[PDB]
Ligand binder design. Sequence first.
Ligand SMILES: O=c1ccn([C@H]2C[C@H](O)[C@@H](CO)O2)c(=O)[nH]1
Ligand SMILES: O=c1ccn([C@H]2C[C@H](O)[C@@H](CO)O2)c(=O)[nH]1
Lengths: 263, 258
Amino acid sequence: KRARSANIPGAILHSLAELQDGLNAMIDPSWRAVRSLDNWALAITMESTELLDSYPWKWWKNLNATPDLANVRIELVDIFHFSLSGAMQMRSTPDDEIPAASLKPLKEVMTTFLPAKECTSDPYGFVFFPLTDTQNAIASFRNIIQLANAYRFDVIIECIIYAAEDLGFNLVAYYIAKHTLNCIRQLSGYKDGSYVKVNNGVEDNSLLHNCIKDVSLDEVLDADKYVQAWNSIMANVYEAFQIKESDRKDAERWFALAKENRL
Amino acid sequence: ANIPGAILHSLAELQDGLNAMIDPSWRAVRSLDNWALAITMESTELLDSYPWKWWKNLNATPDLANVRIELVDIFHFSLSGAMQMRSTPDDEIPAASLKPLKEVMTTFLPAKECTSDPYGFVFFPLTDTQNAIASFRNIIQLANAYRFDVIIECIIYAAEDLGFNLVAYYIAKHTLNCIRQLSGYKDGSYVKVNNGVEDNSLLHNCIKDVSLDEVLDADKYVQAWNSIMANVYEAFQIKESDRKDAERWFALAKENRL
Ligand SMILES: O=c1ccn([C@H]2C[C@H](O)[C@@H](CO)O2)c(=O)[nH]1
Ligand SMILES: O=c1ccn([C@H]2C[C@H](O)[C@@H](CO)O2)c(=O)[nH]1
C-alpha cells in the first residue's frame, strides 16, 4: 500500500482554492475585478524578502544569528496564499488582458540564481535544499521573485510544496491554520486600526504552531478524513483567539459559498 | 540637481572606507550577489513605507521620511556594487551585466499617466504608491542584472523628484553606519530600534537646513560634509576621538590604494 507524498492532489488544491476565494471575498467581494495580477506578484515579492530576513544574511550586524525557521514556515504559507490567489486570478483574466511576459519563455525573462556549494534542488531547478542553509534560501527566493515577475504563480505553488517538504512541515495544515487567522483578522478590524498582530508580547502567527501539532500528512490530504481534519484545525485556531461560535465557519460552509458564487 | 561625476567619485571613497571598517578586504570577501541582494532587500523596505496592503491599515500614509533613508541605503549598496564590478576580473564578469537592458528586464509601468526618469524605470511623483511600486520592482530587476550604474542614476532622479538632498542624506547615514560599527552592531550590543526610537529617524534634523550648493560644490563640499558628520556624531553623543572626518576617509582610501 503506497505511501502518499507531499504533492497536493488536484481535488485538494481545488478545495484550497475555494477557501482562498472565500478569504479574498471577505477582503473585497469583487476581488477578482478589483485586484490585478501585479498586486499578487508584488505581495509574493514582499513576503519573499520577509522570509529571507528570517536568515542571517547580513554581514554587518548580528553575525552569530541563526535562521528563524518558525517564521520561514509561516512566510511560505503566506506566499502560498498569494500565489494561489494569483494562479486563480490568472484563470479568471481575459486573454487581451494577459501580460506578455507570462507567455514568453522563462529563459528570456529570468536568470536562475544558483548557490555556490553543491546541493539538491526541486525539479524545476529554482529552489535549493537544504533550506536550513542561508545561501540556499537566498538563491531560492531570488528565483521566486523573478517567477512572480513573469506571473508563474503555478510554478511558485509547486516550489513552495517542495520547500515545505524539505523543511519537514505540513504545508496544507499550516495553510488552514493561517487561513483561519486571516479570517479572524478581518473579523476583528485589521483594515482599520482595531486589530494588531502583537498581543501583550507574542505575535499572533506564533500561536498557530500548537494548533497543528496533532495533524498528519495523510490526515490532511486523504479524501475521507480531510474535511474533519481541516475543521479541527480551524477549531483550534478559533478557540485560541476566543472567537465566538456564530463568527466561525467550517470547511463545508466555505465550499458551499464557493459553489453558490459559481452561479 | 544631479551629482557631478567628481563628487560621485569622492562618495565612492567614503563608501570604500565604511566597507573596510566592516571587513578589511571587503572586495575579496564580498560578492556581486551580496550587493544585488542588499538592494533587493532595501527596495522592499522602501516599498513597505507605502500603504500597499489592501487588507490592512487602509488609511495609512506614505512614510516618505523613511523613503529618504532607504534611497540612501540603496545608494550605499549600489556604490559598493559598482566598485565591486570595477575590481572583478573580466572573465568573472557576469554575462547578464553586458546584455542590453531590454533583454534583462520587463519594465513595469504604472496604470495612470506619469513622467519618468530618462530610462523609463522610475516614475513620478514618488508620493504616489503605484508609481513607487512600479519603480522599485524595476530596480530589483536592475540589481539582478548587476546594473549598479543605472541604479545610481535612478536614485538620483528619485531624490530630485522627492525634493530632498541626496548627498546630505548619504553623508548623514554614512556617519550613522560608522557610529553603529563603533558601538558593537556586529555582536548585538547596539540596536537600530528600541522603545519606538529608530536611529535613522534622528538623522533628519541633523541636515534640515543644508543646501544643495554646499554639498555638490567641487570646492566647498569637504567642509560641508564635515559639518554634517559633526552634527550626526554630536546627536549620538560620540566622543571626539571616536570621530573621523572626510579627509581621514579620503586619506584612508588613498593610502589603501597602494
Ligand atoms: O487578498 C488577500 C490579502 C491578504 N491575504 C493573506 C495572505 C497572508 O497570509 C496574509 C498576510 O500576511 O494575508 C490573502 O490571502 N488575500
Ligand atoms: O558593507 C556594507 C554593509 C552595510 N552598509 C550600510 C548600508 C546601509 O545604509 C546600512 C543598512 O541599511 O548599512 C554599508 O555601507 N556597507
